[PDB]
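Loading example: each entry is read as two labelled lines plus one structure line.
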Amino acid sequence: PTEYFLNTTVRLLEYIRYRDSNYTREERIENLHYAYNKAAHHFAQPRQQQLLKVDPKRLQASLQTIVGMVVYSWAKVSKECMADLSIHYTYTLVLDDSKDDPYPTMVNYFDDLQAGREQAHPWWALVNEHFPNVLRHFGPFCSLNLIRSTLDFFEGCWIEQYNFGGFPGSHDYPQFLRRMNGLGHCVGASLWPKEQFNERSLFLEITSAIAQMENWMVWVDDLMTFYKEFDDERDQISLVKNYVVSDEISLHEALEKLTQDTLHSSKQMVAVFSDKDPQVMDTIECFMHGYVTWHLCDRRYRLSEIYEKVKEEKTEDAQKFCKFYEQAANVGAVSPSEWAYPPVAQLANV
Amino acid sequence: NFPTEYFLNTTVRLLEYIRYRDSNYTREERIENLHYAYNKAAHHFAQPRQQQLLKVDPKRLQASLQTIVGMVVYSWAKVSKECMADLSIHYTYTLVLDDSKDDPYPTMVNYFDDLQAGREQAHPWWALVNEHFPNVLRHFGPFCSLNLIRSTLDFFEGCWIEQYNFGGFPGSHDYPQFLRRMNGLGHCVGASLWPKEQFNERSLFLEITSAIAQMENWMVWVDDLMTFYKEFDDERDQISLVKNYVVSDEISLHEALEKLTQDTLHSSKQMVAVFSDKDPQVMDTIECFMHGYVTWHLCDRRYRLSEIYEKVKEEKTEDAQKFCKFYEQAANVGAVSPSEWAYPPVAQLANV
């Protein structure tokens, strides 16, 4: 139950100069609801309901976690794009749980794909059918990136089902699996809707953004999830844990490795895009801040179970952790009753 | 000027760490396979349809095909002749795509919709490659197949990105490996080492997945080290992994080369340390791939390493000798005249 967690979290939030200041509560709510309403109606359709084998209460919690993530981090894109992006990332989160074996349904993947026959795996049947709604917002390059990262993600879940953290000595396994399930190219590429950006004019900055952001985004997530993980770890295989197993090092050394990579990633993100196209910098900035805001507020990450355990200290660490947590919750803490309604299950019947 | 001493040291250390030695893979066999793989491929690329849609200069295709068959036969030593032939075709398609400078943009605008609808792709390379892919995929299980499909797709984006001749923005440290993993075919290679006729994908899932994860970095890095000599003065090749480390990380060519060697060596050691005790057939496939991959680099004139074997041919230092020893070893089993297998030329079969 290491409380060192506060130590690392602090220096990061400071370094990136975490402030957020994206949206006005009014705007946040407008977007949260818009995104949720379109996604909710989508998943409530009979076809989605039948092929997407997932516990209702679970689907509902997932959709709300995602709509928040998207709306909070893709702050500069249109409402429609947030909605469609919310549907795609909800599909990925749903899969993130399934314990069903993909093997039998992936045996004719390519032949069915090449022939244009519905994929055997229900998830693929749904994700592919819906994909054009996400791709219509982007140019061919970004679209390719979204397609690939989702394909990688699928493989990542496959591997995860084996709850394998790597052979001891397999130094390369940890990050390999992380990139495989991190959706980094999907995320970093969906940040550039053709409606506001030209892939050909910003090809280099977009490509660079996809490269640098892939690691920032996943590492920052592994760091924010270090609590929710170790706490009630259900035989988890997070990056940090796999670093321990595969690199034969303490859970402290591993955590210190992640934190260092994260601090460096943040440093370089700034030194590179700081002086480039201001509109690119603004999107990257809004993502970083909104992404941190989302992590601190979404319940799923049980970060409250920490604030209510250190609000008493006033030093450097645990002192500012509450100073930041305060900031975030003041713009990011919004009651679900203000946007997430009605529940998916309700629209499903009727 | 070229770091011949430094270079010799790491090469030798690499060959020591991987236990570079002799195999039961005889020259009579090598030639049997070389010719078999080349013959199926040659006939394939000589089909009119292949001839129409695949824009490649004939002589470069002949040379590209000969370099790939060599690589496949020498490294995928434990797979069948059919598997070697089919992988030779696939890896030749990928090598050949580097010869294109045509913007993929317009041919990719409808990529997804055409894919989902089952309509032939607009980019001719995708049309030929997806049409032929089942021939490669039939040798593998679903998991491995998915890796081949993904890596090839990565490769396509890699070639697209390279068309911009971009080494990375100074300060963008994550760019170099991001690009190298993109154009390296690591998961394609790593996964194609396990035909379903010789391995049970599910019974060896952890072994395979681990080999893919570690093989991706060993292969690309070893290749970057081996090609480092032929590209030292090549003003045409401006964006290699090492040249990008120089630009993206803002360090000297030496520091960048120093970065490459450490990664290459640690990769080698961990490869051995991990698979030595695992399933014997697996470690065999892995050990042969490494030895063959190195033999291939040393025997293919494309890399011009004989220029180094000839410069330090008779120096009395240790590394120089240890190198020449290894090199000569490779030449004994690897140095083969193309006239013994690569014939007739693709062009002659095409014209027929």
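Chain B touches chain A through 57 residues (CB under 8 Å).
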